[PDB]
């Protein structure tokens, strides 16, 4: 129920580069796609205390992870709320991973065949082949993602650090420079993110709260500054648009100064109102 209705990706403890991937009723293990083909909605039934694992496929909207009893095979089939479509999510504490057991027959759990790249049911053992990482899909998509960040007021411009010595942050036309790219990293403890500029090693997007609303890059070996960390919240209906709020004071949102789109325009923080100048596209660098 803390997992109910959550949209997650599921990857293999045995090979963290492999994700549960769905198409046309076939479940396979595939490299990260950061899209709906690897997203699943956990649906809780309190009576069974078990979950359906529903594919977020955009075309077939009612497919759920299904054990093809009496075989050991797994597929996605239409949701009929059957016991072989329910799963116990058993969190292995301290290992940050899950064993996923069939509700129909808990003797059997999901097993990752990393060389056939698919799933089967298996009895239990102590290997990582029966252990899975279940993660909120946004964290999954953004964690360790190297991106460029653009105001929705002009997608041809990016938030950039000025250069390697000049730590100021402003808006500029995209020119493919490393000062224009940022690697997002999720901090488990803080439940917050940092944005590391790729022109530096340890430089993070930071709210300089001792200078009002200024944001600059500074070093991440300043350790307990919440001002270095951010919440990244999706905007509804969109695949790439986010509001970005500061961990020190979550009412402070990354803000394009004035909504001005000229080269050199300040990036700052401002009280959150959700106007277009506080919305950001986080995107693959082409």
């Amino acid at each position: 129920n803390s997992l109910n209705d959550k949209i997650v990706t599921i990857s293999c403890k045995a090979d963290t580069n492999l994700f549960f991937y769905q198409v046309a009723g076939n479940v396979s293990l595939f490299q990260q796609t950061r899209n709906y083909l690897e997203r699943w909605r956990l649906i809780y039934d309190s009576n069974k205390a078990a979950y359906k694992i529903k594919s977020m496929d955009i075309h077939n909207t009612n497919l759920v992870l299904t054990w093809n009893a009496p075989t050991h095979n797994i597929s996605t089939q239409q949701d009929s709320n059957a016991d072989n479509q329910y799963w116990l999510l058993l969190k292995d504490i301290g290992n940050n991973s899950f064993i996923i057991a069939s509700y129909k027959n808990p003797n059997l759990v999901l097993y990752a065949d990393t060389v056939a790249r698919n799933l089967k049911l298996s009895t239990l053992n102590n290997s990582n082949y029966i252990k899975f990482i279940i993660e909120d899909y946004i964290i999954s998509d953004l964690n360790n993602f190297t991106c460029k960040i653009s105001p929705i007021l002009d997608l041809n411009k990016v938030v950039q650090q000025v250069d390697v010595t000049n730590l100021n942050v402003n808006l500029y036309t995209w020119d493919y420079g490393r000062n224009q790219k940022w690697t997002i990293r999720y901090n488990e403890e803080k439940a917050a993110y940092q944005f590391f500029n790729t022109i530096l090693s340890n430089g993070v997007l930071t709210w300089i709260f001792s200078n009002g609303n200024t944001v600059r890059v500074s070093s991440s070996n300043d350790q307990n500054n919440d001002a270095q960390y951010w919440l990244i919240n999706p905007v509804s209906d969109t695949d790439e648009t986010y509001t970005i709020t500061n961990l020190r004071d979550t009412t402070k949102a990354l803000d394009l100064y004035g909504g001005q789109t000229a080269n050199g325009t300040a990036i700052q923080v401002f009280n959150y109102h959700g106007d277009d100048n506080q919305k950001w596209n986080i995107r693959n660098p082409p």
Binding site: P70, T71, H72, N107, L121, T123
Partner: protein, 144 residues
């Protein structure tokens, strides 16, 4: 007179993981132990014509048969439909031993857990069977 692929009589029972460990009861469990040369490592296999299965009793306790409990363990109990085994011969005297009854509407089979092929002190369990390739489900029946 012989009705099947496995003649009636006394056998030792071994896991393919070890040629030096022998099936015997230990308390209420079944386990594979060092050779004792005692009756408790001897198993009387009897074919049952009506259902085409085998019942397997311990020579030391001839009114007790290999059965299974409500907890997933193989057991040694008095006769019941849980004592009927359906073997699948997969090599010379290598077998997978299914329960006659479907259990939880699957085939279930003798299964011994191994840690890098070490089965010492493991109890013999009854677990789902899907095919003939699960090493933990393979057992040797050696006539003696």
């Amino acid at each position: 007179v012989e009705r099947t692929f496995l003649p009636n009589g006394n056998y030792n029972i071994k896991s393919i993981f070890s040629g030096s460990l022998y099936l015997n009861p230990v308390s209420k469990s079944l386990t594979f132990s060092n050779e004792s040369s005692a009756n408790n490592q001897k198993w009387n296999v009897e074919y049952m014509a009506e259902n085409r299965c085998f019942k397997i009793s311990n020579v030391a306790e001839p009114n007790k048969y290999l059965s299974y409990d409500n907890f997933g363990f193989i057991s040694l109990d008095s006769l019941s439909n849980r004592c009927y085994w359906f073997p699948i011969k997969i090599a010379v005297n290598t077998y997978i031993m299914l329960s006659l009854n479907k259990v939880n509407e699957l085939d279930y089979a003798w299964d011994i857990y191994d840690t890098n092929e070490n089965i010492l002190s493991q109890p013999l369990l009854l677990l789902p069977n899907f095919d003939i390739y699960n090493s933990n489900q393979m057992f040797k029946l050696e006539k003696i």
